[PDB]
């Protein structure tokens, strides 16, 4: 299934040929991959949880302590605060 | 002198008064007596690590509830933003005041 | 050093010998460790 964004393998079929030109096929293996469709899925969700997360105050999104998701780090004068 | 309360003015009945005593902060204790006995405050700044944004203001007044030979108006400081918030729009320790 | 929530650093730096220093120039108080100095503000041109 070929596109410039990605080309994926979607069908594998084993076939053989007879000496008279006839063709023997087996049921193919069909594959499917997820799609990226922002044109249909663009769901806006308000977020109350990021209270006061201000781009122009001392705030950043960082993972601390090895965690996979970033938390909210605030760097105060004299202390750091963090929401994991 | 270490408490929270609502005020008793005629227009301060809705104001929260957060009060602390210097005597109980144990500031003197941090350094040896031999360094000097006169230990006096030069400047106080207020920090409120609140969910207070860059376009949000806080109204708060810090004042000294006691007798001191302060210059008139030096008895109080107003807070507006809470980030190392001093009593001046510009803080200058060398302006002669 | 590493510090707690809002902890400070108390240290006095002083010269333990004879020198022609004006009173108070014999010592510096450290309040925090961030390249601190003797004053609240350091200015090399204040006439002092």
TrEMBL record, chain A:
It is found in: Secreted. It comes from the Bacteria. This is TcdB2.
From TrEMBL, chain B:
It comes from Photorhabdus luminescens. The gene is tcdA. This is TcdA1. Signal peptide: none annotated. Residues 19-97 form the Tc toxin complex TcA C-terminal TcB-binding domain.
UniProtKB/TrEMBL annotation, chain C:
It comes from the Bacteria. This is TcdA1. It comes from Photorhabdus luminescens (Xenorhabdus luminescens).
């Amino acid at each position: 299934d070929e596109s410039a964004i990605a080309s994926t393998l979607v069908f594998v079929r084993r076939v053989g040929h007879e000496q008279d030109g006839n063709v023997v096929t087996l049921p193919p293996l069909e594959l499917a991959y997820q799609d990226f469709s922002p044109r249909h899925h663009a769901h806006w969700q308000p977020m109350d949880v990021l209270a006061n997360f201000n781009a122009i105050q001392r705030w950043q999104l960082v993972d601390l302590k090895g965690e996979g998701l970033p938390g909210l780090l605030y760097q105060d004068k004299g202390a750091w605060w963090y929401r994991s | 002198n270490n408490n929270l309360a609502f005020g008793a003015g005629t227009d301060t009945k809705t104001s929260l008064q957060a009060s602390v005593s210097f005597a109980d902060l144990k500031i003197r204790e941090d350094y040896p007596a031999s360094l000097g006995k006169i230990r006096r405050i030069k400047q106080i700044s207020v920090t409120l690590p609140a969910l207070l944004g860059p376009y949000q203001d806080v109204q708060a007044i810090l004042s000294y509830g006691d007798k001191a030979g302060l210059a008139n108006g030096c008895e109080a400081l107003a807070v507006s933003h809470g980030m190392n918030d001093s009593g001046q729009f510009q803080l200058d320790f060398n302006d002669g005041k």
